[model samples]
Target chain A: QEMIPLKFFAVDEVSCQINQEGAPKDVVEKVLFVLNNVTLANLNNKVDELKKSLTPNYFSWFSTYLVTQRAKTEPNYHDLYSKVIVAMGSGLLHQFMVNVTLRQLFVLLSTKDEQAIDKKHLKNLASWLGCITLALNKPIKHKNIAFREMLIEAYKENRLEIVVPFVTKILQRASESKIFKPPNPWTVGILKLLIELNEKANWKLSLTFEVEVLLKSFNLTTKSLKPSNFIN
Target chain B: MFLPPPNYLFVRDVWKSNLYSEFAVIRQLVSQYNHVSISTEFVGTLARKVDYHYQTMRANVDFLNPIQLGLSLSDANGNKPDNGPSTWQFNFEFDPKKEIMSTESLGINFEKHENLGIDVFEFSQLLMDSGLMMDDSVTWITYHAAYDLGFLINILMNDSMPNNKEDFEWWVHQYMPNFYDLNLVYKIIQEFKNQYSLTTLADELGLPRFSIFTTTGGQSLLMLLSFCQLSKLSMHKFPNGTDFAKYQGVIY
Candidate 1:
């Protein structure tokens, strides 16, 4: 069967071939269509529109899934998670490393589906997002870029002027679990932006991330990102 | 030693070493010392330690399988060219047991090569005959064996030497020493289960949460056989026992 389409009458694309004999070829084709569509020239405008339509409940549903997944090791967990990520533009939509937590937010941003979550959901989201980002901040060989870019892009896309306070609050909570160090370049770039925001901006706290973390993040981002790219 | 009724049971074993030089030092020491004079069991135990080290040696590296599979097949790298429907559905569920059967029946379906029929039954039967990993006794045995193999395999699988053609034959001879290299490998793997203390092997692997008493799988089976054999040879420690619980029981 074809993948559940995100919009009206979009032709399913085949950017990658299916190797397995049993895989649903139609679904594979449709998924390929959506992923390729994300690279369209006006993709930024589409992303903004998708962001508005995202309901709070969809984020909460996805957040619950993450919590459930972490507790239980489903053999298929990674495969399923990878698919969800690709579908949501998490691979390229976000600013830095896409840890399990940030990917949830990326999912929240992608679907124009309505939010079922409320104030309590926001608290849960904050806590989940906080814990994940902190763990992801550690030293790892690679970091998930898709989730990080989305976090950084959220402020600009939503035009939230109070972005610094919001990010600082999340960072402070994340610190309680573990000191935040962005894994590689993606997280490093985001951390640098957080650092540039002054203490009055409430982002000074995030500057506690290690200098090495900063340099690693900076080097990677400089290589991948351009001024017009959503990466920074 | 708890001796099972004698029969022609299908059997295999695993061996390992942390460093090439460490394995070499052990081998050189054994060769010079006349290990047969030391005791038959001691020679077998040494054989196992080296065997575990060699399992991941050469192209048998576990990570290499993924890399090679992806390179050789289109479906293998399902999501590579821009985000597409995540391919490799079976790679997620690729059962080695099934893989063995398929490779045996239709030959391994390598993309560039034509299909060639293979008889995997002999090998599969050999693996299973040692005792299918059907229950706890098998699992604990296998896990314990893996523990012994882990530190050494971790080291050797990462070893960069013995990769070149000139050094390859010498490397094989040095590690194996037997007429057939796999014979040496199997002997060592069996000793871990039939001879050595499973609990102790578990501890050596630095497994904090899992004890040999609770371990299971193909690795655990190897450990059990190692103990069984080593105990018979008087080279290792295994307690008197009627059931697995007693065999692996932890004293409070």
Candidate 2:
């Protein structure tokens, strides 16, 4: 004789204000759909079309719902997304993405919230950050996503242990991207920050094997500037 | 947990073979009841896509065997006929070795069906003999029955599905007048896409689990039970009586 209450899982609308108001409902839906179905052929057209809705608020929805899609999908499907995001001409939109991404990392790694994003959202976010760092090709402390700041915060919080997958993806994308070939001084410096996290004896075994995966897979001349020499 | 007490009958070769001759008795049994709750087990199903009859026609292939059909019937008060088992499970003949299967469906009891199930070629003949389809006024209750209905037409009715979505679209309403999909009922109950599977919904409603969830007959029985239970929980949410796909089943 008991009654059951009605309920549904999750919602589509997110907290991203276009100007002083929330983004148009259809705008977000169309953007999400276009991005989901975006093919290599339609990439340029999609990018051009997407410009109509560009705002700081756009980053918020993309970071959550868009990132969630990439997280759940296979790597084959999401590889093009990196190119699309990179082509969107970075100033305000790109910087907000960086802020949100860093903020998300802090929240995910935070001990306070029970919502430590599982469901592959964690790895995708990490790889997304990796793609951003490689493509932006900026010198250190030039923007919101500072390896120096990230490393200090990570080390300060003792989350370098969990950051193994993040570093792994960064290096993996480094191998795939053209920017890493005849690597820039900034590029070499990023890997230095990656490996230097291994200076601690405990981190060496775990983080070292990650680097070994690269050496074995890429078969490049095995090398690294001593992790401590680069450590500030 | 024990199987819930529900009236039903199993239709094996005894019902199929003319020697046993259940057609006359079962034909009368169908007339005694006006509400039919049906479920089916198939060799496999194509993946779901964006909704449209043409897409459903393309995705729901004709070759996949509807190996088992669970048909439980009653009046408005869950009062079944006293003459026989109203819950009928007709195990159609399936030979997996020769027939192609969509293994993705993951519910077809291939091994059991191979040993004990009957053949579609023969069951199709017996179905026309039994006059269940004779009365078009009976409202059919189902849960996500699109595929179930698709297979029936594909293998049972037209000697295999005719090639086109529009033809199948008319075929549905042209023959079977009243249809109540409980999933559609739940939509009327709440507009949101409730991620509640039949089992989960049963559990949430504090009902007993189907005795054998993996079997076709049990799920069909549960379909009837679920409709009856929905009747109890909220009558206002049920579809208007005059509308198609709207029904308030009798709860005992």
Candidate 3:
């Protein structure tokens, strides 16, 4: 028998009944209320519940709001943003929600002041941003231009400490994960994004360190399988 | 949208011409004899040529088909050595106005004899080139447009034809015919090549970013078909074209 899928927390019956069409305004308000109150401390337990609670239409608008409006007004919201990044990677969020969240994070990374931010928080945000990149599990789409441009711009501002490590971690995790092995378009998408950034960025961005880290275990001492090598 | 959907009018119009009749007969015979199996190797080789042709067509203003672009036959004296390149079938063309599907074979050999020959890249190219002309360079309507473009692009890109007749029929008539508006499809493909990015092209097309990525294959003629379907669906859902931009970023 197949295993029954389970949620980390109980879904609210009232929220589960709420949908886009039946009570559109109420749905949006409900989603906003939950997300606004959610904190990083309670994110893991609440993420899946929030995901299931929000209608697709509500999630799209709510995520966009968090990225564009809320993140700027509340500096402490970065803590919540960190949790949202993890929630995105949890596979509970669908492509639409993930995409919306991604755009918001990109906008955040683009415009936020690097020095004003906590180093540890920025490091976690950037790392999980890479995780979210793979978690998206969608083909590279047109809306990615803004996200790509913002990342490139951030890199130009000497934010490689944030960007480079994120990208390196992406390559590392992708190399290790069976679900996202090499040649997976998600990896190719990241590589392509980097290549495009290099093309447009006034300063060149290199992934040499990342590449070396990826290939650290290389050795040529294996037994020869080919007949020509056997001849020698 | 240029081609009328399968209806009595279009059916009646096609029947008036005997050109496709000959092709129709040949198609029936080939199917009957089970000679319909297409070689992946053949498709791979032809795909490379078509790729080169598109590159040349883009890169060169004075791009022209070579004079010897068609089939070439070699000497077929039975006593002759079998040490030379095999005879190649050139091309065949169908003309509705002339009511004829004609083939021409030429060679440098003084001896004239029938020998087994192969239809290769040139044959496929001529089919595509001829279909382009037959569709009147106006829109990608007509029977040839439905079948030819998908067939050529599949061979050109994927190196395989639809595995079954049902799939072949679906891709050719039902699915691909929607992209018969060559004006839109060509513009999109040209931009895709120029920008080398689907998102950039989608923005230029005034389409949603995710729309281009919904197709099974990456950006290709097939993607154009998917784009057309999505556009049509979007138009249908938002008949007044209200909030089409919002719908663009969405995938249904």
Interface RMSD of each: 19.6, 35.1, 14.4
DockQ of 1: 0.01
What stretches of model 2 exceed 4 Å from their correct place? Answer: A1-232, B1-22, B45-53, B56-60, B101-112, B160-163, B192-194, B232-252
Of candidate 2 chain B, the 10-residue stretch with the lowest lDDT total is B243-252
The better-scoring model by TM-score among 1 and 2 is: 2
DockQ for each candidate? 0.01, 0.00, 0.01
State the weakest 10-residue window (summed lDDT) of model 1 chain B: B36-45
Candidate 2 structure, TM-score to reference: 0.43
Model 2 per-residue lDDT tens digits across residues B178-208: 5667776665555433354778666766776
Clashing pairs in 3: A142-B199, B71-B90
* CA lDDT of every candidate: 0.29, 0.54, 0.34
lDDT agreement of model 3 with the native: 0.34
TM-score of chain B of 3: 0.22
- TM-score of every candidate relative to the true structure: 0.23, 0.43, 0.31
lDDT of 3 by residue, A1-232 (tens): 1222211111111122234333367665766666766776777666666666654545445555654455434544554664574575532233333454454445434544555545444344444443444333222222232223334545655664556554554354344433234333333334545444444444433444443454342211112111111010
